[PDB]
């Protein structure tokens, strides 16, 4: 199992998905087109801003 973790903006959360492109899915973190796994995202405004 491989676990990756980072912090992004709420706008770009939809860009962490296979076949997606954008500002964050092009130059920062790109998922493979045949991904087999899970993605978890939660709000952290009270401790990261």
């Amino acid at each position: 199992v491989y676990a990756d973790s980072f912090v992004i903006r709420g706008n770009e959360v939809s860009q962490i998905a296979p076949g997606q492109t954008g500002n964050i899915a092009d130059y920062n973190y790109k998922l493979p087109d045949d991904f087999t796994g899970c993605v978890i995202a939660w709000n952290s405004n009270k401790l990261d801003s």
Partner: protein, 49 residues
Amino acid sequence: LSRLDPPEAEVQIDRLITGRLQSLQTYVTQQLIRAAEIRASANLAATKM
């Protein structure tokens, strides 16, 4: 392909591949009957000769 992301492109073109294969199978199915119809007449012509 130019208007839909591959996640949905592989669903859209999957509805064309099956239809075109169904279109293609009927052609050979009818040719396989026309061939036997022609073969009967060819055998009759050979006997007459």
